[model samples]
Target chain A: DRPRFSFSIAAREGKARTGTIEMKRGVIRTPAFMPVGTAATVKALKPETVRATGADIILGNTYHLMLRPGAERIAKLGGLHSFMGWDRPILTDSGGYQVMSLSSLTKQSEEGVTFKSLDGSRHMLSPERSIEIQHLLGSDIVMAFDECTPYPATPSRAASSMERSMRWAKRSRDAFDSRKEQAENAALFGIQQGSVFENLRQQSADALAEIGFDGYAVGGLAVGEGQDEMFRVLDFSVPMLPDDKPHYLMGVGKPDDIVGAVERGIDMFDCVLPTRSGRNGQAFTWDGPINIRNARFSEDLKPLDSECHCAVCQKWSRAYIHHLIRAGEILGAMLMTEHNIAFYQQLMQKIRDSISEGRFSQFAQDFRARYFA
Target chain B: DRPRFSFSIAAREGKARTGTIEMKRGVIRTPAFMPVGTAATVKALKPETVRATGADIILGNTYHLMLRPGAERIAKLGGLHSFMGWDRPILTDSGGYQVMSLSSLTKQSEEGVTFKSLDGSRHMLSPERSIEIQHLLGSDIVMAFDECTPYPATPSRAASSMERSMRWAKRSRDAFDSRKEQAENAALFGIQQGSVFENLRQQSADALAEIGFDGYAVGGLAVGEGQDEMFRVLDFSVPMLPDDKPHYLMGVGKPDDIVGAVERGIDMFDCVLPTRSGRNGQAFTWDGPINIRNARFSEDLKPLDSECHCAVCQKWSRAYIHHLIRAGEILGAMLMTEHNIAFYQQLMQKIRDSISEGRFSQFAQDFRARYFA
Candidate 1:
């Protein structure tokens, strides 16, 4: 007796909101930070382990999956859920961003983009194709195909990029509606893309709302635009989207940045920083990020974060992790990544709790005082 | 109260036997197969995952540990067991074999072997030093320092190598005894190295028996001697060791190799084949090994082994594993290694069960008929 797709806000403090995005498969708590499961895995983690980190949903990369295992292959094998052994809500982005970023010799037309994959094979990704791929992946939440405008663009350049993304959003919407059965069970999110200009962002948000979506994502920020500038853009940009719908900020950010975004009314987020930094020996803690490979930790017998209650912190010591990282052991990456994800999820939970209890302002100030340099 | 170290046989079928070796930390069911945890960690696996595979004890490499994190540092951090997160018994090998195999500019003397580390630093490992390092590591089962004799040696070369190892065995015993407190809690195993010569093996065994150790290991056979040749050597060599003590076949290999060694009266074994092979995408099944990266498994929905009861096989399909392996995902290696370890432990369980029931001969025959090409 649950809705196929629904977003319900339970509490709000200032601009911060705590809610649940209920999909048929599972319910994602917000402001949720979806750990990126690019290529169908959260790097060194198991699906069960990822879930144990308290994440309600994981974001999958449409571009990587389309190239490697292929969406059709995954569908025949019972979708990405069964393929990767994570049977929860999966949010798959459209192949637009990665197709432009990762592929070679790319050419963009009004209809689609044509490019060669890393393996030197040529392919095309349009709104219809992106929607079809996400459908085949059995994605719980599908993103609309859109171009991510570059960070430092002229007003005219930003205008053209924003306009094309709005056209693609309509095409993406039509493609979703065409798959009647999947459309009934899945949610489509339209991404709003503009460089940094306030007018372009307004135009983008207006066009996406006109077409309509289950959720709205503010895109084109967190791409070399510093946190100060990203927060500035979010200040004006987030208010333009439908307040009732779930608002997702694409590819954001450090812990401080996340706290700032949550205060700005963003409800969902995804990033590769936690996982990637973990593999590189950086561990996030309440006091900020620390490099575990530092010589000072060679004989320090403390856990990575003394206050954190992660499985890694509960059992392992900093010295053991330091030795593993110094030796380039895979368990080091596995443990570090596990702890980092737990830190991120724990941060999100704290934010949600603070907002629910109407203490987000005080919590945000305390967090920044400890987390920032 | 339990003794520091004790071995008791429960059943015997022909030369094969099933028993338990009780130590302070845990009990090892024989014929036991110890998974090689080369550095502190067992490659990609977590200590708990390794334990879940049913290993009562794991092996640590003294050579690698001594070079990287160093033995003293581990002792300062609460020994190898706590450092690696494996709380059960740990058997650490002497630094001899790896120093000879992995180092540069090696020189052997009457007192010890001197070699250049992988990082170009020079170090020496005598029988006394080996014992001391194992003592510092708080090893449950300590191995005697011995040169793993190369195959295809002249009779005289084999004789001298066996004689030098015999002298080192005496030194290892004295060194171990010098640490009175540690000696009370730990068990030292003397290694018998005589190349492929039966007479030299008998002499080596006789010398080790005179020196008196808690256990005896048949070394220097798995280094390039074919299974048939190794089995032939085990025929005469295994009988020469004290039958009451655990007869360990150092580095004794494949499932068939283990079965053959068990049939020849060996009680314990250790090898790197399963973990190493898993990283290379080779998975051992009841019907021999299969490369998971092969194209045949591209769309196959079956698990790696139909009869395997590992967590990996229960949850994942060959198609998914195939995709991960092809994509070079770290999870692929983790899953593959987990399954392979489970397979090895399962095989050991079956062997122990068969021996207990007096059906080991029949089981071995049936296994070889299907497993052999």
Candidate 2:
């Protein structure tokens, strides 16, 4: 097994880079799309299906796991990887977003947030506690606890939130490495928060850099902001992150969004878009998103896409998929979700290939022309 | 392709037999349990997964498919086998059962049964039309149409119902073989209905034998009739069936139910017990069923069955499946159904082995003792 964590850029073109993050579990190719496996499953898929989509890594939600099975229970059962029968790398979010939104009767302080659980019982989560939860879950890539700043924020309010997050980052780092051996095994990533303001973004980036992390994520952008504004935020925020480390664009986005973010030098991504949209009968293609529920596809004998190849496309026709969606068969959801995830991973693969070949600009331009026009 | 439909008694012990029925699509091993695929797709499972469960054939409901997507549409697109991507043999039940049960404003006459669907839509079906619909859907084994007489039907009432079914059986037979080439490819089966009257069952069998069919099914059982009553009917009803042809017990039932019927010289069986119960968190094992939804299963780290060789048992823990069921995840349903179907298929293989080895009586006795205990 490898000791210590590292990122290596194999090839670069303008702002984009093709690289790999070396962890004990495995190497994750850069410009990767990690399918969300909230509640320890990719919703409708098995762990192997997720792996079959060419996903080198997966994102597990801490909020769901901690609430249901409990982190301590997972630790007793041999941690998240073994618990889910997944032998690959798993990156777990710090429960910052879900605990804030899903849990009721919430109260927040400088230390952390307190909330009422399903049994109407009180539970508290601080940066230290969040770090401890990640350690217990045995996540290969652990995220630092941060205040997920609300969508609309005044510059003054944003600065206060950003500074508090900076402090929490320090505490998260402190709590994480306290156990020595665990500190060396799993990697920790810090999050940058500042709505659209470049200066606040720079400040958050610098603060996190001072605290130091194995990686950095651009957070708090895709909440309510339009694509253009989110792109603007990413343009300045992603560059502010340390160039040598892996930069993750959290919970982003449509196909073009990832394509554009890669152009802005983001190297890692995790989102529920592909999975969620798939369950809803929406498919992701190089051309754009297509709704399988539409009646027009009923007798359409072609595959989901002529240019793409995934197991679903090779095995099923659009008409068959259309029929499945209408019938409410679970295989419909399974195949759709599998295809969408394959589409995202395929997109990422193409992005990495183009960057390595020094043709990323041409790739992105052609993609936009076909997808948007 | 086989020139004509045929059944052979490969081996026999007491009243039990181990044999194979040759068909154009494939060979069906005797005393097999066919998974119920009401629509083109089995619920919560892929066709390949069903095939992997060791099933040589699957039973589709004409009621569900005819109502939505329509049999004609499937025929136009190529056939049920190609439409669902399941190349194995498929047996489709006549819509008789569902029209009497699921539809509203029903009317029965010398012509046929006329009913209104859920949306106040009208439908008319006769014996000739039932045969035509199944033919249109390109079924490998088509069941003849008959009025599924209700339980507790009196001798006189049962006789009257059986007479209508006999008349319909002749029409069904005529309609099925109207096209010589189609008749050669798709084998037609006749359904025998007599409630619990022994003489009436004999009469129903004689009428079907006179007309002749590739196989015979003892229908109108497992409809909330006690197991004792079902077996009592089978005792007399099964013998009336032709010795050389395949004797099918429609919807003949839980493990013990099947064991007893097979002992009475029954050759084929199909039921929704395994698949349906699986969706409801129930698993069938040689020892009996254990509800995965029960609290006792929580944190139980063993596989679903220690004795089985199915993929679900080999790869997943009972704990993982329990977690999936409790969380209402689709993967839970998939795995449970998989395990259950595999369990049933495994049981059938053992039964066939016992008959082939001339030890069926001993095997059945031992099986029932352990299963009940």
Candidate 3:
């Protein structure tokens, strides 16, 4: 039908679904795990290398880009796709998250957050500014601007924060409509925030669906909440999302966490855990994460993971990578990061296949025991 | 005939000649530049990446390998080729030069040089010991153990050092033959060690030929000697070698120096300039070397070099590389090193082509003016 955007389900097993999200840039397979590119680069890897790992899309930080290369400068440079040489679909986070975490001094009000950057540069990031920055970067998936409310909040505190975010999401939706040609084709996802409170989440969700969005995101969950608590909240929370729309989990993490969330019907995820952990010498294998820096791996003489079919595991041995990591060589990090991302993608692919075959329940149960252990 | 090692001249222009150096491992096309892979790696690059950049061979540091990994350990791990994962021919330099440069409390005498490593471990390296290490490491081309005579020495001082080196060369050739299997397939090249004197070089060369080595190397020239002085020594030094064997300029340098040495009939070269300069944010271009850190390249949208055919130059722009360099990224060092090494191999290829086509003189004339200017 040449629709602006849509999600089509191929199969479903319980809450898990196998689906394809069609867009102009590319098709994003549901249960997608986007490698986070905090800066234009994904730390050590090239864009093509990231693509080779089976990523349909990658996440860019609106806060990092807005500050460093400047959103206006990137617009002049022909957008993030041209600047980073990645032609794939790029889903940039709204500047809200980093504006709270990175900014040294801050003031929050309905007009939006005003803060002092690390370098003491003044920045005012309102709903309008965040959406404008997203437009400037030509982001394929635009996140509705809202607060990533801090963890350990009282119930009253959580409701006010969630309500403010709902107001901002409406303003964010309004801003998207004003973005001329760039907005015409791009998709905006509204975020639902409740800080583990069920009614507040439903309120946030119902309010956003009234304003309308291309998709939905369950935010403010992965902040510091334990998986059990997050799952407890999501049990009653996730079903509040419309079945027709894609559901994304913001700042969602670890392989097992994503697996659990998928079982509860989340559609998309992004995290720096795979890439950042690799840089720090922690590699994710099917058995779990192994710290390659440990002395035992010095002469192990086996590939990082024999089960992993990534290019890194096919050639390099643990001993060799141990030497490279100890010597502080960059190839160590690159190979490790590549392999971890590959591991995540491979897991996602298996999950999709299992769901399509109506056997995701068994796959998840078996995977959790091995991966979590 | 199945020769242990052979060198045959194919084409010539004035003193510049193109030839084939055949060994059991591979055939090295002259004049060739072997990229230095210190510590079993071409820093910031993979072995295949280095080979794809057109390297005919690579050099491994005997001192670095023996001290850290231990030659015995490498031998137990199926030698340096298996240890480092490089399938191509590897030329290992005798540890004498680095032993002097890197060690402290050193002693040099007829029995051989003894020094203490940085860890304060006492180590002794005789001609026999160096050859044994190379054998254990399974080096394709082994350099003769010789003192790299220090620069600015008096004639009498230079004479004694050169004489001691000639004796060590004889011992190295003897030790190479002592190894049962390694000696049958491996190549041992004798080194000429006169500081800057034509007569001493002649005496050293004569002694090496009488000792009956496989190839000849003009050593101790690139230590601190200027190109003019090094070229002057080569003019008299190169012709002293046996006509049928390869003439290698050990640790020989910069692009212009390589060009001059090739003109003086030197068939092989190895240096760290390309890789070292690349890591320091400098890139070699056909025009000359450019510092990628310069502000002018911040938005310069052209490839690294206009007249290059390397994949890095073909795919990446100076602006992107400049961004990488500015951010202290390793990909900057990798891409730059790759381009420089590729430029060097292509330069060698061009020189070989010019000699075969009988246009070497004109090519060198134009190249020198452009490169030096």
Per-residue CA lDDT of model 2 for A1-373, tens digit only, reads: 6656889999999889999998899989998899998887887788888888899999997777877677887888778887788888999998777644654567888988887756977667789988888888899999998877887889998888888888999999999889786798999999998767899999999999998999999978778888889888887788888999999988888899899999999998888998888989999877778999899988777788877789888878888888988888888888899999999989999999999999999999999999876
- TM-score, predicted candidate 2 vs. hidden true structure: 0.98
What is the DockQ of the complex in model 2?
0.68
How many backbone clashes are present in model 2?
0
- Please give the ranking of all candidate structures by TM-score, highest first, separated by commas: 1, 2, 3
lDDT of 3 at B93: 95
lDDT of 3 at A300: 76
Docking level of model 1: high
Best TM-score among the predictions, by candidate number: 1
Candidate 3 CAPRI category = acceptable
Output the number of the lDDT-best candidate. 1
TM-score of chain B of each: 0.98, 0.97, 0.97
Give the TM-scores of the predictions, in the order they appear.
Answer: 0.99, 0.98, 0.95
lDDT of 3 by residue, B128-223 (tens): 989998998999999999988888788998999899999999999888988878788889999998889989989998999999887899888887
Runs of candidate 3 exceeding 4 Å displacement:
A1-4, A105-109, A114-119, B1-4, B105-110, B113-124
Error of 1 at B337 (Å): 0.5
